[PDB]
Amino acid sequence: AFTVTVPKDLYVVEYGSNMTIECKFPVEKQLDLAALIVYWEMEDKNIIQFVHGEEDLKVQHSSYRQRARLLKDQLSLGNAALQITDVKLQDAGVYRCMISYGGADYKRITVKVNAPYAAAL
């Protein structure tokens, strides 16, 4: 079966830094945009909605608009990579990647936000 996997299911990310959490999905032949759908959510907030290459800034929850994007270059490698800039304490919690690509699956990723004392923040 089509399986989505996570290299890390727990991330510790610095307050004020950028973070990229990743979900892997199998891509054998050249990636087909017409078959690919990727959703990222956390606690009922819509973060990424990528439909056959289509996206719409408006559906993105306001707390993530202008901070969150899907790294397009990574998709052809079978990597659904969510990048969030300027990590806030409110970003800690559980994220869901849901991928449809000749089959469908999803994984949960847990993000912890820390503030190292000698870090930039």
Binding site: I37, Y39, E41, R96, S100, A104, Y106
Partner: peptide
């Protein structure tokens, strides 16, 4: 999952 449930509908 409700999110998972809604996602399968919109896709399938």
């Amino acid at each position: 999952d409700c999110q998972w449930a809604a996602f399968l509908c919109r896709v399938y």
